[model samples]
Target: EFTFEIEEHLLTLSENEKGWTKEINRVSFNGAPAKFDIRAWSPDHTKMGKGITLSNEEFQTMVDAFK
Candidate 1:
């Protein structure tokens, strides 16, 4: 048997010379500071596609936007 749990967070957007992109910063994974991608799954919602990872600060900003 397989069991799974997911935690998802939408990212904030910023435009720069590289065009538009999602930004993640000030976050950490394991122990040291780290950043990771927030991805979209396929139609079935199981397979993932390109995604963006956000920092703790950015993630908080996103949550605030929804409010």
Candidate 2:
């Protein structure tokens, strides 16, 4: 099953950016100009492969957005 949560920060930013540059920034932020997580998983227990985990380099790349 797929799940999602509303980002209050993002919603609030959208409400606040009624003008030009602020609206641009809000669009960019939501569109992921920076790095972020893209999680994936297997539904079936009968899968051939074990679970997946990112390497240190990959995880770092995903989490680097907070900078």
Candidate 3:
């Protein structure tokens, strides 16, 4: 698991054994309900092991900025 902290909350991104071939990814907060409940993968087809997760508001900002 890879971890980082933001505003006192711990965020994590991890890969399971299945990530070797199937891209099993997970994201969660240390003390919050913000989480990814199912498998999430990278956008690039070749980068099978990559994954990401963001808060709802953060994701919205991302989409808006990219537009």
Best by TM-score: 1
Candidate number with the higher lDDT (2 or 3): 3
Task: Mark the regions of model 1 whose C-alpha exceeds 4 Å error after superposition.
Answer: 1-36, 41-48
- Residues 1-67, model 1: lDDT tens digits: 4322233334545434534444333333345445555654443434444566567687778879999
User: Over the full model, what C-alpha lDDT does candidate 3 score relative to the true structure?
Assistant: 0.42
lDDT of each: 0.48, 0.28, 0.42
Task: Choose 1 or 3, whichever is better by lDDT.
Answer: 1
User: Which pairs clash in the backbone of model 3?
Assistant: none
Clashing pairs in 1: 24-54, 24-55, 25-55, 38-52
Cand. 1 Cα-lDDT? 0.48
Question: Which stretch of 10 consecutive residues in model 1 shows the poorest summed lDDT?
Answer: 1-10
Query: Stretches of candidate 2 above 4 Å error?
Result: 1-51
User: Candidate 2 lDDT, tens digit per residue, 14-63?
Assistant: 22232211111111124433322222212321111222333447656766
How many clashing pairs per prediction, in order? 4, 0, 0
lDDT of 1 at 42: 40
Backbone clashes, candidate 3: 0
